[PDB]
Ligand SMILES: Cc1cc2c(=O)n(-c3ccc(F)cc3)c(=O)n(C)c2cc1C(=O)C1=C(O)CCCC1=O
Ligand SMILES: Cc1cc2c(=O)n(-c3ccc(F)cc3)c(=O)n(C)c2cc1C(=O)C1=C(O)CCCC1=O
């Protein structure tokens with residue numbers, strides 16, 4: 124059931140912003156590890172005396188990495204005279220965020236028809252304002268409201284990346300590409316799911332998307348179900364400690380848990396990322412036992428050939444299936460020092476009309492399947 | 503003239519410690535960019551609830567990257583009960599360092615015969631204590647005194663990496679190597695060179711090493727001149743703004759300016775690093791005009807073949823010459839967001855007896871040679 128109750132016009136995911144202590148080193152690591160090109164910058168070289176911001180792109184996926192400079196460089200400025208290209212930036216907020224959470228997502232940005240209205244309607248419907256709407260060079264409007272923890276939902280709208288960002292030199296811009304194409308979903312961890320759901324669905328009008336693991340969760344979705352925002356809470360007293368609870372302890376509270384990036388060819392993406400795991404890229408979760416792949420034929424054998432199923436086994440890919448489509452997925456190890464944020468790589472097969480959002484779900488059944496497999500392997 | 507006045511027995515450079523906000527991402531970037539292997543770790547997986555520390559090695563070069571966890575993880579601990587593997591670590595000092603300076607070197611560590619005596623003699627001769635000597639598992643003693651700004655000189659001594667560090671899994675440890683072999687010199691920037699020299703030479707007994715640019719500098723050296731510690735100060739009012747002054751402004755004061763890493767084959771090192779500049783590695787300074795290489799034959803043509811001189815031209819290598827030997831050198835762009843710390847790659851040819859320290863100097867003459875070349879090119 125989809126009541127299409129969005130209180131304002133939402134388009135797609137626009138970008139994800141990481142708050143860092145050094146944006147250069149994180150962005151270069153992410154670029155090599157994920158195969159994303161350097162596409163725009165705003166920093167001292169572009170006249171920004173406030174923050175350094177570097178944008179990586181792959182397909183429609185946009186990752187932004189921002190860190191503060193010394194406040195001394197901009198001590199003479201006032202908000203009207205700021206050289207910051209993202210006017211919601213604040214030195215103190217950014218330093219406080221990174222010392223509290225470490226490396227993590229500050230902003231989940233969605234493109235909307237009108238960011239001023241989206242902000243107004245949101246706040247009128249209970250959203251906690253974070254940064255009021257501001258118009259950038261009469262071209263782009265940006266506004267922010269609180270989402271969960273210290274994460275904000277950022278609204279972006281264009282009359283016709285951002286003003287004040289320059290295209291970097293293509294000599295500096297090597298055309299890496301491992302097949303990642305867009306952001307599929309962005310997941311939050313909270314201590315209590317009920318209040319978090321009521322709050323976010325309350326101000327967006329997003330609807331609940333049709334669905335012994337250590338969590339309960341629910342998925343909020345926009346009208347066409349292309350903006351997908353799941354939220355998790357821990358379940359306590361399960362002998363095996365909830366991953367959600369471990370997140371909350373190491374992150375100092377609620378925050379973004381994982382980003383799921385859609386690949387146009389998950390096999391090529393994972394070959395390319397795994398080649399780089401030990402030379403600056405990303406590590407992946409432990410592979411499941413071969414039993415899991417020995418039971419895969421009896422479940423998705425009509426969707427994937429036996430060549431592709433053993434190709435899943437080499438790479439550690441998981442497969443799950445809803446009633447409309449099939450989901451191929453895998454998880455990275457945490458992206459930084461803390462066991463908090465990680466990345467999921469996915470590919471969806473089915474639900475063609477274009478592909479409808481959420482085709483195959485989010486891997487729900489792989490919990491019971493992996494537990495059972497573990498037991499079958501030991502035997 | 504070498505009076506050999508060291509007030510305690512110094513051996514070699516032992517390691518350089520970077521204080522980061524996220525040690526994982528900086529260490530992975532540095533590993534790929536410089537060709538350094540992951541060799542030891544101390545973090546949650548080794549029981550360290552205080553800081554995450556990752557060691558990279560290439561030849562005898564040891565780069566350590568450390569970041570704090572949430573203080574909440576170790577709130578029950580006291581210094582006697584700490585799980586930190588580096589007992590001088592302090593959450594507040596580290597957060598204050600990185601928010602003040604950004605990514606940079608916290609510790610220049612030298613191996614000494616006896617770290618407790620080195621600390622005592624140093625302090626008795628004017629050094630400002632930073633962390634008193636502490637014995638680690640009856641095996642290693644470590645002590646720290648202030649060097650300049652928020653950089654410390656760390657003394658390390660072994661009765662027979664550090665206790666509490668584990669060797670990482672060789673699956674995780676890819677044997678990268680681009681030819682870097684050891685730390686040659688570590689350079690500080692201060693506002694006033696005189697007081698900085700008097701202070702450091704005062705407590706070490708290091709002696710001044712035999713020597714319109716925007717700086718004055720001087721080099722302190724241990725008895726055998728293998729530990730080399732140059733220091734720079736700005737010269738003001740030169741039309742072209744002093745790089746030392748730009749450093750001091752963006753770094754919020756004194757600190758480490760550059761690390762010079764010796765390569766056993768600078769041509770292979772720079773080929774390998776330049777291949778990776780645009781895919782997560784390090785960028786290099788702008789190349790000099792071909793005029794500079796057109797004047798190189800008339801200066802070092804007896805040391806390098808005309809094939810090797812044009813090989814310098816491809817790679818942007820600089821060449822300078824003292825009276826004892828020749829110096830091949832090149833500089834990276836700054837390592838992080840701020841125009842502060844950078845790296846120099848070097849190779850020294852001459853002064854064999856082993857190679858004596860400082861053979862060829864530090865590139866003194868390349869200042870006038872590059873200015874003149876610039877003028878000859880324009881013509
Ligand atoms: C957060 C998460 C954890 C696991 C997980 O922990 N395991 C898992 C691994 C290893 C074992 F041994 C057992 C279970 C999984 O298989 N999957 C498929 C998982 C999927 C997700 C996930 O992507 C997600 C949610 O579940 C609810 C909100 C929507 C969403 O995006
Ligand atoms: C800090 C530094 C700057 C430059 C420099 O700025 N230039 C330079 C580039 C480009 C132009 F256009 C003009 C000069 C150089 O050539 N060299 C060779 C340089 C060498 C050093 C250096 O390594 C050093 C010192 O000079 C004194 C203390 C010992 C030490 O290690």
Ligand SMILES: [Co+2]
Nearest residue numbers: 310383467485
């Ligand atoms: Co997911």
Ligand SMILES: [Co+2]
Nearest residue numbers: 689762846864
């Ligand atoms: Co140097």
